[PDB]
Design a protein around this ligand. Sequence first.
Ligand SMILES: C[C@@H]1CN(CC(=O)N2CC(C)(C)c3nc(CO)c(Cc4ccc(F)cc4)cc32)[C@@H](CN2CCOC[C@H]2C)C[NH2+]1
Ligand SMILES: C[C@@H]1CN(CC(=O)N2CC(C)(C)c3nc(CO)c(Cc4ccc(F)cc4)cc32)[C@@H](CN2CCOC[C@H]2C)C[NH2+]1
Ligand code: NA
Ligand SMILES: [Zn+2]
Ligand SMILES: [Zn+2]
Lengths: 107, 106
Amino acid sequence: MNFPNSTNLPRNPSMADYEARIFTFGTWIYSVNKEQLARAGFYALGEGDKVKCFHCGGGLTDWKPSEDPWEQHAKWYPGCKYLLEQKGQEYINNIHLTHSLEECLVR
Amino acid sequence: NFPNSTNLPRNPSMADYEARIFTFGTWIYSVNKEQLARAGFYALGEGDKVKCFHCGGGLTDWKPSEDPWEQHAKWYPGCKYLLEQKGQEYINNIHLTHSLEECLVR
Ligand SMILES: C[C@@H]1CN(CC(=O)N2CC(C)(C)c3nc(CO)c(Cc4ccc(F)cc4)cc32)[C@@H](CN2CCOC[C@H]2C)C[NH2+]1
Ligand SMILES: C[C@@H]1CN(CC(=O)N2CC(C)(C)c3nc(CO)c(Cc4ccc(F)cc4)cc32)[C@@H](CN2CCOC[C@H]2C)C[NH2+]1
Ligand code: NA
Ligand SMILES: [Zn+2]
Ligand SMILES: [Zn+2]
């Protein structure tokens, strides 16, 4: 099924280490930075710039220069327990507020 | 299109049980309209499409075995209404449950 892992157990424990995740990108000259994706929980799927969070399983693609790994992780997979552990709710809410503001302003 | 994870509801006009209830009208679908309302959902008037007033998360194609709260948690686990009403341990229960549901059947 599509649905995102909101348990405290990672969906892909084989990608639980940074170094495991880093290797998946290989050479990588997409708009957004591979080290920063890896720190944000992501590993490469091996097609385009598709990445998945090792924990929540959540997938993201089509990275723009202005799109931040942690920020996009929170936008789209807010139930992620890796996210919650690494950044912690005060960060997490401010970024939700930031997003939900933009969506309720120019849009 | 991304789900609202703030403590402020995306559709405050549907914040009241009363107001959500009125959206259904005569409801022919397999899931109970009051259970849906209590769980934050209101109807679009397009088949059994509903959305949470707070997170804005949409759900459709309701089978008889699908509970509003469980589905809310499955698909929109960041919803703060959900968090306020059920607690995180309820949410975890549901997710622990669905993951393990997946795993036994294969
Ligand atoms: C960095 C940003 C991310 N944006 C969102 C995005 O990437 N999302 C949102 C959503 C979570 C709904 C989503 N779900 C899927 C399906 O699982 C996939 C595809 C996938 C990704 C990685 C994989 F390993 C395998 C499959 C992408 C995606 C991008 C904008 N989105 C691009 C896709 O279409 C929608 C549009 C809003 C811009 N860049
Ligand atoms: C009660 C259950 C719910 N299931 C999941 C479901 O309904 N989801 C999951 C997901 C969150 C990805 C999703 N995103 C959209 C797009 O917004 C919509 C469509 C929508 C709903 C209400 C609206 F106001 C407007 C649009 C449905 C939907 C149902 C199974 N899903 C049905 C849709 O296709 C996928 C399949 C897994 C079974 N019933
Ligand atoms: Na109706
Ligand atoms: Zn994640
Ligand atoms: Zn909600």
